[PDB]
Amino acid sequence: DIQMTQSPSFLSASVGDRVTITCKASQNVADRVVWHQQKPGKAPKALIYSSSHRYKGVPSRFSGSGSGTEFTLTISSLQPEDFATYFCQQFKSYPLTFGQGTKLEIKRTVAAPSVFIFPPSDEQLKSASVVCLLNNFYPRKVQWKVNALQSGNSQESQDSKDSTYSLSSTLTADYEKHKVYACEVTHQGLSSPVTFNRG
Amino acid sequence: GVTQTPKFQVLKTGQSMTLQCAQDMNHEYMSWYRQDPGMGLRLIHYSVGAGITDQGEVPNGYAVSRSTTEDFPLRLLSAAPSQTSVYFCASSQGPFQPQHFGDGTRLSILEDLKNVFPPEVAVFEPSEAEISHTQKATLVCLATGFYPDHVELSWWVNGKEVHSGVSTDPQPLKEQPALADSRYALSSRLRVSATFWQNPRNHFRCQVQFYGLSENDEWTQDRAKPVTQIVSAEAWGRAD
Amino acid sequence: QVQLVQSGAEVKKPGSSVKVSCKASGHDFRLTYIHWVRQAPGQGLEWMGRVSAGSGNVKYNEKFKGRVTITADTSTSTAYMELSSLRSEDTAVYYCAVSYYSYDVLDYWGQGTTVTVSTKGPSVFPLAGTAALGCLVKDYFPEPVTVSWNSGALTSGVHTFPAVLQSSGLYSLSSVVTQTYICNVNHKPSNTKVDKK
Amino acid sequence: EVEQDPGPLSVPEGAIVSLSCTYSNSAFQYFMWYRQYSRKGPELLMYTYSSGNKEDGRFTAQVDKSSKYISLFIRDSQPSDSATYLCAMSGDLNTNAGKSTFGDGTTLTVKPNIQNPDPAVYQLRDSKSSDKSVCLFTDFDSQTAVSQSKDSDVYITDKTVLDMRSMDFKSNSAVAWSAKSDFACANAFANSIIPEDT
């Protein structure tokens, strides 16, 4: 069976630029590769079949090339709706194998973040969790104190307007044993480590 | 005119193939059609000149190229059951001008080549009563048990193909019509004068040309490989 | 035109079976090959079987041995897919895709059925230049959830984060926005809509 | 798709036949007429570049651009004219980018004029071997129709016309054969018969 390792993993680019992705093969698959487009959370649609040919309706910007074990996809003069994960599949031999994917987000200049520390709720405390928001920063580290760097519990999770990531990192009998819970994040736009109380 | 090849073919699913079509008429415009029942003639690709090709109405699964004005090959990237069709090449002096079509390529995509099987040819001598009643003699020749429907049946009397008095059934019979890939049978009759039949020096050969597997293919199944061949059955003039 | 739909959303705890339909319209069903592929959260894409609609001829991937089953129903023109003895890690969007123009080429896809390997309701807790505020928490099964700003009057400035899977195995998420300001939390399967200030 | 012509049509030998197509929702300029026999490609019959009439032997092609109506007239039609006729129009920059656009086709069957019908069923034995017997139902009038086999064991071919061009003689024929023993010469054609000889 064939292993289709996909490159450049995941890249950023601005609109209307000759951006390309590559799909390496393990065995010889000749011209038997298909390039698929999948929107962020919808039905995938096939774009290029037999490594070079566009289906009817695919815009001329989408071009594929390569043969044997080296295959390239080109979306020369990128355009907003051409902004999503792309993956390569082979149909040389069963079983069919795909690539992990290549998501394409919008490139912008460095966007400084907006750190907010949110105290827990007494309604919640009646059952605590401090909340940190890295609102609208580009591109895509957070550490938490309750000054102890408690590790093993915390969890975290393109906006539609200006290509700015919003980031949320949450903390989760020891809460009232400590007084200061200062959030802390690291980035480049915020060159230095920008960092409430009980009542 | 417009020569295209081959007229018949069988290929396994997933296989690639080029359909050749060339013209001497120096025409600029060329196009490839596929013809289907209930769909009419649907355009696959068209080339307005050397080095320029464009998609037709049903281009997916096919590919062409126009390196020279004279030729216009058409490729199948991966044979699929939906590509079992009749393919016609055409040439024209321009997009507006009328096109002149080739004879036609009848294509058959099959998932398994152990369903391709040659025919069996038998000639049945005319009835003694027919000669006495109509002063004509009809020989019926049966080509039975062949798949797919890539056959050409000809009548040879004294080693020369004849057309007068020949009737060949336009479409074959499904021997087992309940089957999705049933074998076919085909019948034809040659009618001659009673005196002509009763000349013992008259040699009647019914020859069927079957287009099956190529030697490039692989034949795993037990019996003889269904290679393209001529299968004929012969009858001799009988004075009584 | 041509289309595919893959069944309703299933949900099963470990150790059961599941059947997913895939209704194919468009061209002749018999000339089509229906392939099933799956893709787990944060994983690659995994082909695991196909069937010849016009011949009933089935090939599955080897790593789902005896566990997947594909059937082509030529009359009703839909394809089925039976994953049984559900492992823990059979949590993925399961896709059906059809190769019709070219063999094994997967010309088009379906929307994506979701199978994840009980039911409970959530809770929402308020979170007291810019002064952002958000609803949050608590624990629910199964998915999905939706939140809106004042029943849908502002889309710029509100950032709702995708749900995370906490230690217990049941999700909770944060929904924040950047005058009267109220979230409108909605959870389909548990009949729970809480609109909290 | 923008062409409009229907399906099956049958005419007795010697009669004038009229075919037609319409193209409303189009301003076409050039009109063709192809003829397609079985196992071969379309053959160009007529082509016109204007509203008007054009005649070539027994064929006559007419174009009425005002009524978006074109017609082909075969006169003194012979059984050899039985084929599938395709119209096609071109020259409209707003339909198919001006390229040719074909109707799905009309099927024509010129039924031979069988003077002196002599319907009969004969049984034929094989030349060399195979112990099989075909049955030839022949020399019946074209108004007689041959029915398909209603039994799985036996089968029957559709009626077909052969022309002995030497003596200007035409005659329909159909054959039936099987291996099951309960079928004989006088059995296979128990569908829509007249008084024959057996």
Residue numbers in the entry:
A (entry chain L): 1 to 127, 130 to 142, 145 to 150, 152 to 162, 166 to 180, 184 to 206, 209 to 212
B (entry chain B): 3 to 242
C (entry chain H): 1 to 117, 121 to 131, 140 to 189, 198 to 216
D (entry chain A): 3 to 200
Verbatim from the authors:
However, the TCR can also act as an innate receptor, engaging ligands via nonclonal, germline-encoded sites. Therefore, we used antibodies specific for discrete human Vβ regions. Given the number of human Vβ regions and their relatedness, we hypothesized that the high specificity of several such anti-Vβ antibodies might rely on their engaging regions close to or within CDR2 and HV4, akin to BTNL binding to Vγ. Therefore, to explore the consequences of engaging human αβ TCRs only via germline-encoded regions, we have as a proof of principle used TRBV-specific antibodies that we have demonstrated by genetics and biochemistry to engage residues within or close to the counterpart Vγ regions engaged by BTNL molecules, namely, CDR2 and HV4 (19, 20).
Here, we use mutations and structural biology to show that this hypothesis is correct for several Vβ-specific reagents. In sum, although their fine specificities were distinct, the reactivity of each anti-TRBV reagent was commonly determined fully or in part by germline-encoded residues within or juxtaposing CDR2 and HV4. Thus, except for G16, which is encoded within FR1, all evident contact residues (red) were encoded between amino acids 59 and 64 and between 79 and 84. L79 makes hydrophobic interactions with the VL chain, while S80 displays main chain–focused and main-chain–side-chain interactions with VH together with electron densities. In sum, the Vβ-specific antibodies tested here offered a means to engage αβ TCRs via germline-encoded Vβ sequences approximately aligned to Vγ residues engaging BTNL proteins. Affinity maturation was associated with increased cross-reactivity toward TRBV6-1+ J76 cells. In sum, TRBV-specific antibodies induced a signature activation phenotype, as assessed by CD25, CD38, and PD-1 expression levels, that was displayed by the great majority of cognate T cells and that was significantly different from the collective phenotypes of αβ T cells responding to anti-CD3ɛ. In sum, engaging TCRs via germline-encoded subregions has, under the conditions used, reproducibly induced an aggregate TMLE phenotype that can expand our perspectives of T cell biology.
